[PDB]
């Protein structure tokens, strides 16, 4: 029966060993006999947990007699790939990768249970990467269970001049690619983007402009992947008109059936007449391709598995349906197997299907035996005049050091709108008043500098109507080299000191009219337009007095839909915001009726540049395409300062500078 064997008590060295005890322990032993088997501290075991549900797996850290005279054992828990935040969703296979029914993670978590609760003894071994072939396998043969890692419920952490190549996927304009690279630079690491894959021809345009050296790819992620696999195989062997200079390689395409095609050059035919041709038709000229593949390899035009070092996320999640892009992403990661993986995405991941996708990523990363951790981070805390909360998923090899989330650099107050499914994923200060934090910016700080321009400004480049008027403005107008862009290496980047992309949306005349009409007061919105009234619940209704006003065109003041938004209310629609405050999230679509996008004093709505400043975009950074598309480009971008912070932490991880683990990190200047 459950008696305390193991000889006398701890003798009261115990209270030094276990101060908290003196649920308070009135005595302490080194061993216990339950049933007829005997165990001692440090043993591995199975605890009987609740009714018809699993058995806690545990390590014994304590044997003591409660003041009750009841006999307890305190054990530190082992977590099953389920019990972790990734619960269920253990089923995912990725490229023949799966969880291993006997594998666990050591939790610093502890609970005390009466002894009868002990089923029997496990044998739980532990294994490190450095064992390598069989050395693990022999053990895994021996053990009932094994663990290589530790699970911390915070951030769901699964945790045990140099040059780094980066691959960015779904990168428009390269906001995150860039910021990451900058931070990395500060760390002392040189992180250069050697490839970027994006669908939008424009975002590609912009990226290429600002990162001339990176290899931009205008294609779907999938294609790029399949093309990757072939590119590997074909890369191996290196192998009715006369061809020349195959200039291009692509898998899939617009109409193209799946397969490899080459951009071709025919002798004396000129750029026009260059055609994408299927691999087969080129059989007649193998040497051309052999040549092409040859340099291409030396040039590393396409990545091979050992080559990718760090890689960027961002797959849009719009389960099986529009979620596909993350599946594709993780597949990429699988084929390439880089050292580091950084994935950004919206918050809903953890809110939708009860956090289905957050765990899809987490798992896919872990079943791949990557150390993984994650956190939610608000853009504002890092120096932007906006509150934008995004999810960042870290992963790294076991050969490497898991990065960590840089804490808020600014005083922005976080309301913890964190999903439950992950409750403690938020990188925030907790109340420790490290007020050595800067003042949360408002719009004025960002944009007070910019020269005054009208609704129609059709000039990508215009000079500055002023001088940096604030710390921030001082900051964002800085040479590529004053930050460390190194896109151009040693030398000055193009578009020196010029102000670029300062343009608003061109409003169809009448809009120009409603907007012109607005008060330029502080709180101005459509309610100031001459149709105004109130209701028990505030509902804009027409004042039953004035006749409907018509513009200098055949149009009204166009309340027509405005009147009903949130069924009324919604002071948000046509109306100004101002330097006095922040935009919660810069969005992809500039248009007044629902958005409160309107420049405080200018009657033009907000120019893209402004929105970019808001997004932390360094000014030297250019963009391309029509307005409406530029807008999107910046609307999608990760706040560059945030990416910069992550870039730094990552730099340190990669270089190996770091400290005994915990979720978040710090930095001086940065």
């Amino acid at each position: 029966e459950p008696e305390f064997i193991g000889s006398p008590v701890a003798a009261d060295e115990a209270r030094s060993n276990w101060p908290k005890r003196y649920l308070k322990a009135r005595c302490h032993y080194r061993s216990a006999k339950v049933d007829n088997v005997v165990y001692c501290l440090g043993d591995d075991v199975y605890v009987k947990a609740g009714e018809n549900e699993a058995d806690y797996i545990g390590r014994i850290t304590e044997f003591f007699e409660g003041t009750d005279q009841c006999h307890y054992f305190t054990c530190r828990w082992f977590f099953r790939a389920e019990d972790t935040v990734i619960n269920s969703l253990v089923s995912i296979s990725v490229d023949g990768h799966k969880h291993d029914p006997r594998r666990v993670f050591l939790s610093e978590e502890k609970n005390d249970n009466v002894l009868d609760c002990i089923i029997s003894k496990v044998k739980i071994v532990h294994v490190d990467p450095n064992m390598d072939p069989k050395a693990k396998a022999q053990l895994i043969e021996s053990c009932d269970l094994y663990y290589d890692m530790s699970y911390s419920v915070a951030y769901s952490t699964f945790a045990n001049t140099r040059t780094a190549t980066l691959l960015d996927l779904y990168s428009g304009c390269g906001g995150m690619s860039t910021g990451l690279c900058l931070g990395a630079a500060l760390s002392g690491l040189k992180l250069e983007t050697r490839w970027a894959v994006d669908f939008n021809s424009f975002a590609c345009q912009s990226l290429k402009y600002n990162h001339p050296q990176t290899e931009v790819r205008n294609e779907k992620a999938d294609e790029f992947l399949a093309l990757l696999k072939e590119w590997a195989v074909l890369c191996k062997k290196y192998v009715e008109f006369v061809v020349e200079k195959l200039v291009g390689i692509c898998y899939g395409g617009s109409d193209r059936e799946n397969g490899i095609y080459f951009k071709v050059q025919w002798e004396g035919y000129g750029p026009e007449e260059d055609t994408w041709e299927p691999i087969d038709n080129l059989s007649d000229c193998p040497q051309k391709i052999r040549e092409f593949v040859q340099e291409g390899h030396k040039r590393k035009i396409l990545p091979l598995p050992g080559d990718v070092d760090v890689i960027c996320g961002g797959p849009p999640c719009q389960k099986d349906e529009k979620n596909k892009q993350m599946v594709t992403f993780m597949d990429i990661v699988a084929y390439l197997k880089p050292k580091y993986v950084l994935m950004e995405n919206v918050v809903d991941i953890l809110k939708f299907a009860d956090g289905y996708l957050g765990k899809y990523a987490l798992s896919c990363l872990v079943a791949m035996k990557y150390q993984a951790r994650l956190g939610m981070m608000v853009a504002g805390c890092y120096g932007l005049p906006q509150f934008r909360m995004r999810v960042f998923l870290w992963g790294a090899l076991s050969s490497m050091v898991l990065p960590k989330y840089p804490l808020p650099t600014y005083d922005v107050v976080v309301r913890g709108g964190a999903p439950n499914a992950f409750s403690q994923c938020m990188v925030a200060y907790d109340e420790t008043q490290k007020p050595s934090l800067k003042k949360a910016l408002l719009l004025g700080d960002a944009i007070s500098d910019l020269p005054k321009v009208q609704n129609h400004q059709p000039n990508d480049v215009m000079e500055y109507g002023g001088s940096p008027k604030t710390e921030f403005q001082r900051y964002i107008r800085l040479s590529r080299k004053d930050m460390l862009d190194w896109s151009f290496g040693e030398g000055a980047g193009p578009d020196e000191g010029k102000l670029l992309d300062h343009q608003p949306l061109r409003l169809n005349n009448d809009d120009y009219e409603r907007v012109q009409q607005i008060p330029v007061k502080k709180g101005a919105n459509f309610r100031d337009l001459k149709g105004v009234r109130v209701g028990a619940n505030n509902i804009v209704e027409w004042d039953p007095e004035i006749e409907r006003v018509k513009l200098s065109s055949g149009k009204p003041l166009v309340p027509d839909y405005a009147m009903s938004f949130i069924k009324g209310k919604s002071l948000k629609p046509f109306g100004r915001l101002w330097w006095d405050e922040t935009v919660p999230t810069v969005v992809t679509r500039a248009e007044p009726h629902n958005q409160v996008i309107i420049h405080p004093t200018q009657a033009r709505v907000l120019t893209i540049r402004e929105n970019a400043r808001l997004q932390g975009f360094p000014d030297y950074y250019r963009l391309f395409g029509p307005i409406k598309e530029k807008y999107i480009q910046v609307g999608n971008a990760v706040a560059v300062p945030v990416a910069r912070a992550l870039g730094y932490c990552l730099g340190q991880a990669y270089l190996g500078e770091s400290e005994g683990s915990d979720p978040l990190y710090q930095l001086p200047p940065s």
Partner: peptide, 7 residues
């Protein structure tokens, strides 16, 4: 050395 176009 040589190859051929497709529709």
């Amino acid at each position: 050395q040589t190859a051929r176009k497709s529709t």
